[PDB]
Amino acid sequence: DYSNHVWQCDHTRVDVLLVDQHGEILSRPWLTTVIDTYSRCIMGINLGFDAPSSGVVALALRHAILPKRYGSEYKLHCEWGTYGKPEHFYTDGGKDF
DNA sequence: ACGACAGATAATTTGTCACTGTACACTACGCCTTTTGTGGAGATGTCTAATATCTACGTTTTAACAGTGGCCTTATTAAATGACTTCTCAACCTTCAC
Ligand SMILES: [Mg+2]
């Protein structure tokens, strides 16, 4: 019925091969998204090599629930003015969830 | 008129065969996460019979001695000894003898 009423979360394998800072191949990361079902903002993400795990879920949840701050190395013109807790959380059946 | 006989005729499917688009190019049941009932110690808590100890229960044994009980004959006369008691503890005069 309103914003934050149901957040939704899932993970997927990003389709970019990453590299170490020394330049050698690192297998693709996983991306986790937390999404407002009303508003349809993306509320927060976690991007990393760690497989789908409750610590990864918790890491996306932290970013989503908390206010956002980014420095000038992020050349943003907008601002990611979204925060606050969900009232419900809607997921698939993964063992992390 | 319309439609109604037997047969024409535009479909409809059955069957040929030259052509071409494509896979074969090895390269998923495998990586990763979570729950979970079974299992191995290993610190810790549980709580007894029992072989004493550890005095007392008091109970025997001793000897000391205290009390009861039996026995013990009694007389006279003499002696020795030691004592006791009582009594006594004059004094002047006369007479005849040298
Ligand atoms: Mg999912």
Task: Give the phi and the psi of residue A75 in degrees, each rounded to 5.
Answer: -80, 35
CB count, 10 Å around CB of A17? 10
Give A8-61 as a DSSP string: EEEEEE-S--EE-TT--EE---EEEEEEETTT--EEEEEEESS-S-HHHHHHHH
- Residue A81 · residue A39 · CB < 8 Å: no
Q: Output the distance from A61 CA to B66 C1' rounded to whole Å.
A: 116
Resolution given for this structure, in angstroms = 2.3
The three-class DSSP label of residue A72 is: coil
* A55 in contact with nucleic chain B (CB within 7 A): yes
Q: For chain A, how long is the longest CA-to-CA vector?
A: 49
What's the gap in Å between A57 CA and the centre of ligand 1?
Answer: 12
Q: How was this structure determined?
A: cryo-EM
